[PDB]
């Protein structure tokens, strides 16, 4: 059983590249992080920053989560991210994604001891 913290890392961290360099990034990544196994995950963001930088967000600007809980945090600074969203034609198991590279603030929900990201709420 994956911890919530480990699931976050698998779904959202990509420290290995500074940015998506092709329009096929999302197709490539969604597959390999096993986010298309059972169904096409519809929306998923990858963050191209160190794990330390992403964990540090839990110490930054406290905001409400979409769900009304108040354990979310917005990064003071922008981060390099890639936004992956399934195209309207996509059908499992031939999952297809639009890739959008950007520099935006991230908002994550944090939980636990240590107090670490367990959900990606949005980018700004
Ligand atoms: Cl979950």
Short mmCIF file of N, CA and C and ligand atoms in Angstrom, two decimals:
data_model
loop_
_atom_site.label_atom_id
_atom_site.label_comp_id
_atom_site.label_asym_id
_atom_site.label_seq_id
_atom_site.Cartn_x
_atom_site.Cartn_y
_atom_site.Cartn_z
N UNK A 1 0.87 -1.21 0.00
CA UNK A 1 0.00 0.00 0.00
C UNK A 1 0.89 1.24 0.00
N UNK A 2 0.67 2.09 -1.00
CA UNK A 2 1.34 3.37 -1.14
C UNK A 2 0.84 4.31 -0.04
N UNK A 3 1.74 5.00 0.65
CA UNK A 3 1.36 6.15 1.47
C UNK A 3 0.81 7.28 0.59
N UNK A 4 0.02 8.19 1.18
CA UNK A 4 -0.46 9.33 0.42
C UNK A 4 0.73 10.15 -0.11
N UNK A 5 1.76 10.28 0.70
CA UNK A 5 2.93 11.06 0.30
C UNK A 5 3.61 10.43 -0.92
N UNK A 6 3.72 9.10 -0.95
CA UNK A 6 4.34 8.42 -2.05
C UNK A 6 3.48 8.52 -3.31
N UNK A 7 2.16 8.44 -3.17
CA UNK A 7 1.26 8.57 -4.29
C UNK A 7 1.42 9.96 -4.91
N UNK A 8 1.46 10.99 -4.06
CA UNK A 8 1.70 12.35 -4.57
C UNK A 8 2.96 12.39 -5.42
N UNK A 9 4.06 11.82 -4.90
CA UNK A 9 5.33 11.85 -5.61
C UNK A 9 5.18 11.19 -6.97
N UNK A 10 4.60 9.98 -6.99
CA UNK A 10 4.43 9.23 -8.23
C UNK A 10 3.58 10.01 -9.23
N UNK A 11 2.50 10.61 -8.76
CA UNK A 11 1.60 11.30 -9.69
C UNK A 11 2.12 12.66 -10.15
N UNK A 12 2.93 13.33 -9.32
CA UNK A 12 3.19 14.75 -9.54
C UNK A 12 4.64 15.19 -9.62
N UNK A 13 5.62 14.37 -9.22
CA UNK A 13 6.99 14.87 -9.28
C UNK A 13 7.72 14.44 -10.54
N UNK A 14 8.36 15.39 -11.21
CA UNK A 14 9.28 15.03 -12.28
C UNK A 14 10.46 15.97 -12.25
N UNK A 15 11.35 15.69 -11.30
CA UNK A 15 12.61 16.38 -11.06
C UNK A 15 13.64 16.12 -12.17
N UNK A 16 13.37 15.16 -13.06
CA UNK A 16 14.37 14.67 -14.01
C UNK A 16 14.54 15.58 -15.21
N UNK A 17 13.56 16.47 -15.46
CA UNK A 17 13.66 17.36 -16.59
C UNK A 17 13.27 18.75 -16.12
N UNK A 18 13.81 19.78 -16.77
CA UNK A 18 13.54 21.15 -16.37
C UNK A 18 12.19 21.62 -16.89
N UNK A 19 11.74 21.00 -17.98
CA UNK A 19 10.50 21.34 -18.65
C UNK A 19 10.13 20.22 -19.60
N UNK A 20 8.87 20.16 -19.97
CA UNK A 20 8.45 19.29 -21.05
C UNK A 20 9.06 19.86 -22.33
N UNK A 21 9.65 19.01 -23.16
CA UNK A 21 10.32 19.53 -24.34
C UNK A 21 9.53 19.13 -25.58
N UNK A 22 8.45 18.36 -25.41
CA UNK A 22 7.65 17.98 -26.57
C UNK A 22 6.17 17.86 -26.22
N UNK A 23 5.34 17.92 -27.27
CA UNK A 23 3.91 17.86 -27.11
C UNK A 23 3.46 16.46 -26.69
N UNK A 24 4.38 15.49 -26.72
CA UNK A 24 4.07 14.13 -26.37
C UNK A 24 4.43 13.78 -24.92
N UNK A 25 5.00 14.75 -24.21
CA UNK A 25 5.39 14.53 -22.81
C UNK A 25 4.28 13.85 -22.01
N UNK A 26 3.06 14.43 -22.05
CA UNK A 26 2.01 13.91 -21.20
C UNK A 26 1.62 12.48 -21.57
N UNK A 27 1.53 12.20 -22.89
CA UNK A 27 1.20 10.84 -23.28
C UNK A 27 2.18 9.82 -22.66
N UNK A 28 3.46 10.20 -22.75
CA UNK A 28 4.65 9.47 -22.28
C UNK A 28 4.60 9.26 -20.77
N UNK A 29 4.32 10.34 -20.04
CA UNK A 29 4.43 10.35 -18.59
C UNK A 29 3.22 9.73 -17.90
N UNK A 30 2.02 9.98 -18.41
CA UNK A 30 0.81 9.47 -17.83
C UNK A 30 0.83 7.94 -17.86
N UNK A 31 1.47 7.44 -18.91
CA UNK A 31 1.49 6.01 -19.10
C UNK A 31 2.44 5.41 -18.07
N UNK A 32 3.66 5.94 -18.10
CA UNK A 32 4.74 5.39 -17.31
C UNK A 32 4.58 5.53 -15.80
N UNK A 33 3.92 6.59 -15.34
CA UNK A 33 3.56 6.70 -13.94
C UNK A 33 2.34 5.88 -13.58
N UNK A 34 1.89 5.08 -14.57
CA UNK A 34 0.81 4.14 -14.40
C UNK A 34 -0.48 4.87 -14.04
N UNK A 35 -0.73 6.03 -14.69
CA UNK A 35 -1.93 6.80 -14.43
C UNK A 35 -2.99 6.50 -15.49
N UNK A 36 -2.72 5.51 -16.34
CA UNK A 36 -3.70 5.10 -17.34
C UNK A 36 -3.98 3.61 -17.25
N UNK A 37 -3.68 3.00 -16.11
CA UNK A 37 -3.76 1.55 -16.02
C UNK A 37 -5.21 1.08 -16.09
N UNK A 38 -6.02 1.57 -15.15
CA UNK A 38 -7.40 1.14 -15.01
C UNK A 38 -8.28 2.01 -15.92
N UNK A 39 -8.05 3.33 -15.90
CA UNK A 39 -8.81 4.32 -16.65
C UNK A 39 -7.84 5.45 -17.00
N UNK A 40 -8.17 6.34 -17.95
CA UNK A 40 -7.37 7.54 -18.18
C UNK A 40 -7.61 8.54 -17.06
N UNK A 41 -6.58 8.83 -16.24
CA UNK A 41 -6.73 9.92 -15.28
C UNK A 41 -6.99 11.18 -16.12
N UNK A 42 -8.06 11.95 -15.88
CA UNK A 42 -8.41 13.07 -16.77
C UNK A 42 -7.45 14.25 -16.74
N UNK A 43 -6.96 14.63 -15.53
CA UNK A 43 -6.18 15.85 -15.36
C UNK A 43 -5.04 15.53 -14.40
N UNK A 44 -3.84 15.95 -14.74
CA UNK A 44 -2.72 15.68 -13.84
C UNK A 44 -1.57 16.61 -14.13
N UNK A 45 -1.04 17.22 -13.08
CA UNK A 45 0.09 18.13 -13.25
C UNK A 45 1.40 17.50 -12.73
N UNK A 46 2.47 17.70 -13.51
CA UNK A 46 3.82 17.32 -13.12
C UNK A 46 4.62 18.56 -12.80
N UNK A 47 5.45 18.46 -11.76
CA UNK A 47 6.25 19.57 -11.27
C UNK A 47 7.73 19.26 -11.50
N UNK A 48 8.41 20.18 -12.18
CA UNK A 48 9.83 20.05 -12.49
C UNK A 48 10.64 20.93 -11.56
N UNK A 49 10.67 20.51 -10.30
CA UNK A 49 11.42 21.15 -9.25
C UNK A 49 11.87 20.01 -8.35
N UNK A 50 12.85 20.30 -7.50
CA UNK A 50 13.29 19.29 -6.55
C UNK A 50 12.15 18.88 -5.63
N UNK A 51 12.18 17.64 -5.14
CA UNK A 51 11.27 17.22 -4.11
C UNK A 51 11.33 18.17 -2.92
N UNK A 52 12.54 18.57 -2.48
CA UNK A 52 12.68 19.50 -1.37
C UNK A 52 11.90 20.78 -1.65
N UNK A 53 12.01 21.33 -2.85
CA UNK A 53 11.30 22.60 -3.14
C UNK A 53 9.79 22.40 -3.07
N UNK A 54 9.29 21.25 -3.54
CA UNK A 54 7.86 21.00 -3.50
C UNK A 54 7.41 20.76 -2.07
N UNK A 55 8.17 19.98 -1.29
CA UNK A 55 7.80 19.77 0.12
C UNK A 55 7.76 21.07 0.92
N UNK A 56 8.63 22.01 0.54
CA UNK A 56 8.78 23.27 1.25
C UNK A 56 7.49 24.07 1.14
N UNK A 57 6.69 23.81 0.09
CA UNK A 57 5.44 24.55 -0.08
C UNK A 57 4.54 24.42 1.15
N UNK A 58 4.60 23.27 1.85
CA UNK A 58 3.83 23.05 3.05
C UNK A 58 4.10 24.07 4.18
N UNK A 59 5.17 24.86 4.03
CA UNK A 59 5.56 25.89 4.98
C UNK A 59 5.25 27.29 4.48
N UNK A 60 4.61 27.41 3.31
CA UNK A 60 4.49 28.69 2.62
C UNK A 60 3.08 29.25 2.87
N UNK A 61 2.40 29.71 1.82
CA UNK A 61 1.19 30.54 1.98
C UNK A 61 -0.02 29.63 2.19
N UNK A 62 -0.59 29.64 3.40
CA UNK A 62 -1.75 28.82 3.74
C UNK A 62 -2.99 29.39 3.06
N UNK A 63 -3.67 28.56 2.30
CA UNK A 63 -4.93 28.91 1.65
C UNK A 63 -5.95 27.78 1.80
N UNK A 64 -7.22 28.10 1.57
CA UNK A 64 -8.23 27.05 1.42
C UNK A 64 -8.01 26.18 0.18
N UNK A 65 -8.30 24.87 0.32
CA UNK A 65 -8.37 23.92 -0.76
C UNK A 65 -9.73 24.08 -1.44
N UNK A 66 -9.84 23.56 -2.66
CA UNK A 66 -11.07 23.61 -3.42
C UNK A 66 -12.21 23.03 -2.58
N UNK A 67 -11.86 22.04 -1.75
CA UNK A 67 -12.84 21.29 -0.98
C UNK A 67 -13.20 22.00 0.32
N UNK A 68 -12.64 23.17 0.61
CA UNK A 68 -13.01 23.91 1.80
C UNK A 68 -12.15 23.64 3.02
N UNK A 69 -11.34 22.57 2.98
CA UNK A 69 -10.38 22.34 4.04
C UNK A 69 -9.31 23.43 3.95
N UNK A 70 -8.56 23.65 5.04
CA UNK A 70 -7.60 24.75 5.07
C UNK A 70 -6.17 24.24 5.28
N UNK A 71 -5.92 23.02 4.81
CA UNK A 71 -4.58 22.44 4.85
C UNK A 71 -3.91 22.53 3.47
N UNK A 72 -4.26 23.54 2.66
CA UNK A 72 -3.59 23.80 1.40
C UNK A 72 -2.61 24.97 1.54
N UNK A 73 -1.63 24.94 0.63
CA UNK A 73 -0.54 25.88 0.60
C UNK A 73 -0.21 26.21 -0.85
N UNK A 74 -0.02 27.51 -1.11
CA UNK A 74 0.41 28.02 -2.38
C UNK A 74 1.89 28.39 -2.27
N UNK A 75 2.64 27.99 -3.27
CA UNK A 75 4.03 28.35 -3.37
C UNK A 75 4.17 29.86 -3.54
N UNK A 76 5.10 30.46 -2.78
CA UNK A 76 5.41 31.87 -2.92
C UNK A 76 5.80 32.18 -4.37
N UNK A 77 6.64 31.31 -4.96
CA UNK A 77 7.18 31.53 -6.28
C UNK A 77 6.49 30.62 -7.29
N UNK A 78 6.70 30.96 -8.54
CA UNK A 78 6.33 30.07 -9.61
C UNK A 78 7.33 28.90 -9.68
N UNK A 79 6.81 27.80 -10.24
CA UNK A 79 7.54 26.57 -10.51
C UNK A 79 7.33 26.20 -11.98
N UNK A 80 8.29 25.44 -12.51
CA UNK A 80 8.12 24.84 -13.82
C UNK A 80 7.20 23.65 -13.68
N UNK A 81 6.10 23.67 -14.40
CA UNK A 81 5.17 22.56 -14.35
C UNK A 81 4.74 22.17 -15.75
N UNK A 82 4.12 20.99 -15.85
CA UNK A 82 3.44 20.60 -17.08
C UNK A 82 2.04 20.11 -16.70
N UNK A 83 1.08 20.72 -17.39
CA UNK A 83 -0.32 20.42 -17.22
C UNK A 83 -0.71 19.38 -18.27
N UNK A 84 -1.26 18.25 -17.81
CA UNK A 84 -1.68 17.18 -18.68
C UNK A 84 -3.20 17.06 -18.59
N UNK A 85 -3.90 17.18 -19.74
CA UNK A 85 -5.34 17.01 -19.71
C UNK A 85 -5.78 16.12 -20.87
N UNK A 86 -6.65 15.16 -20.58
CA UNK A 86 -7.05 14.20 -21.59
C UNK A 86 -7.86 14.91 -22.67
N UNK A 87 -7.57 14.61 -23.93
CA UNK A 87 -8.29 15.22 -25.05
C UNK A 87 -9.72 14.70 -25.07
N UNK A 88 -10.62 15.40 -25.78
CA UNK A 88 -12.01 14.99 -25.79
C UNK A 88 -12.24 13.66 -26.53
N UNK A 89 -11.34 13.30 -27.43
CA UNK A 89 -11.49 12.05 -28.18
C UNK A 89 -10.93 10.86 -27.41
N UNK A 90 -10.02 11.13 -26.45
CA UNK A 90 -9.33 10.06 -25.73
C UNK A 90 -10.33 9.00 -25.27
N UNK A 91 -10.00 7.72 -25.52
CA UNK A 91 -10.80 6.67 -24.90
C UNK A 91 -9.90 5.53 -24.42
N UNK A 92 -10.14 5.13 -23.17
CA UNK A 92 -9.39 4.07 -22.53
C UNK A 92 -9.58 2.80 -23.36
N UNK A 93 -8.54 1.96 -23.60
CA UNK A 93 -7.16 2.25 -23.17
C UNK A 93 -6.24 2.81 -24.25
N UNK A 94 -6.69 3.85 -24.95
CA UNK A 94 -5.82 4.57 -25.87
C UNK A 94 -5.71 6.03 -25.42
N UNK A 95 -5.31 6.23 -24.16
CA UNK A 95 -5.44 7.51 -23.47
C UNK A 95 -4.57 8.54 -24.20
N UNK A 96 -5.11 9.74 -24.46
CA UNK A 96 -4.35 10.78 -25.13
C UNK A 96 -4.50 12.09 -24.35
N UNK A 97 -3.44 12.90 -24.36
CA UNK A 97 -3.32 14.09 -23.53
C UNK A 97 -2.78 15.29 -24.30
N UNK A 98 -3.29 16.47 -23.95
CA UNK A 98 -2.70 17.75 -24.28
C UNK A 98 -1.68 18.10 -23.22
N UNK A 99 -0.52 18.52 -23.69
CA UNK A 99 0.61 18.93 -22.86
C UNK A 99 0.71 20.46 -22.87
N UNK A 100 0.70 21.07 -21.67
CA UNK A 100 0.96 22.49 -21.55
C UNK A 100 2.06 22.76 -20.52
N UNK A 101 3.21 23.22 -21.00
CA UNK A 101 4.34 23.61 -20.17
C UNK A 101 4.09 25.03 -19.68
N UNK A 102 4.43 25.29 -18.41
CA UNK A 102 4.15 26.59 -17.84
C UNK A 102 5.04 26.81 -16.62
N UNK A 103 5.01 28.05 -16.17
CA UNK A 103 5.66 28.49 -14.94
C UNK A 103 4.56 29.12 -14.12
N UNK A 104 4.10 28.41 -13.09
CA UNK A 104 2.98 28.85 -12.29
C UNK A 104 3.21 28.51 -10.81
N UNK A 105 2.44 29.14 -9.93
CA UNK A 105 2.43 28.76 -8.52
C UNK A 105 1.67 27.44 -8.43
N UNK A 106 2.08 26.61 -7.47
CA UNK A 106 1.34 25.40 -7.19
C UNK A 106 0.62 25.55 -5.86
N UNK A 107 -0.50 24.81 -5.74
CA UNK A 107 -1.25 24.68 -4.50
C UNK A 107 -1.38 23.19 -4.20
N UNK A 108 -0.91 22.80 -3.01
CA UNK A 108 -0.95 21.42 -2.60
C UNK A 108 -1.63 21.35 -1.25
N UNK A 109 -2.24 20.19 -0.96
CA UNK A 109 -2.70 19.92 0.40
C UNK A 109 -1.60 19.14 1.12
N UNK A 110 -1.42 19.46 2.40
CA UNK A 110 -0.35 18.85 3.19
C UNK A 110 -0.93 18.12 4.38
N UNK A 111 -0.30 17.00 4.74
CA UNK A 111 -0.76 16.18 5.87
C UNK A 111 0.42 15.40 6.43
N UNK A 112 0.30 15.11 7.73
CA UNK A 112 1.11 14.08 8.36
C UNK A 112 2.25 14.65 9.19
N UNK A 113 3.03 13.71 9.74
CA UNK A 113 4.28 13.99 10.39
C UNK A 113 5.32 13.10 9.75
N UNK A 114 6.24 13.61 8.91
CA UNK A 114 6.35 15.03 8.57
C UNK A 114 5.17 15.52 7.72
N UNK A 115 5.01 16.85 7.73
CA UNK A 115 3.89 17.50 7.09
C UNK A 115 4.24 17.74 5.62
N UNK A 116 3.70 16.89 4.73
CA UNK A 116 4.19 16.79 3.38
C UNK A 116 3.01 16.84 2.41
N UNK A 117 3.25 17.10 1.11
CA UNK A 117 2.14 17.15 0.16
C UNK A 117 1.51 15.78 -0.02
N UNK A 118 0.19 15.76 0.00
CA UNK A 118 -0.55 14.55 -0.34
C UNK A 118 -1.57 14.78 -1.45
N UNK A 119 -1.80 16.00 -1.92
CA UNK A 119 -2.71 16.21 -3.02
C UNK A 119 -2.28 17.46 -3.76
N UNK A 120 -2.46 17.42 -5.07
CA UNK A 120 -2.24 18.59 -5.92
C UNK A 120 -3.58 19.26 -6.18
N UNK A 121 -3.75 20.50 -5.73
CA UNK A 121 -5.06 21.14 -5.79
C UNK A 121 -5.21 21.96 -7.06
N UNK A 122 -4.18 22.72 -7.45
CA UNK A 122 -4.31 23.60 -8.59
C UNK A 122 -2.98 24.25 -8.87
N UNK A 123 -2.86 24.90 -10.03
CA UNK A 123 -1.76 25.81 -10.31
C UNK A 123 -2.36 27.19 -10.57
N UNK A 124 -1.56 28.23 -10.34
CA UNK A 124 -2.01 29.61 -10.47
C UNK A 124 -1.10 30.38 -11.41
CL1 LIG B 1 -6.34 8.79 -3.22
#
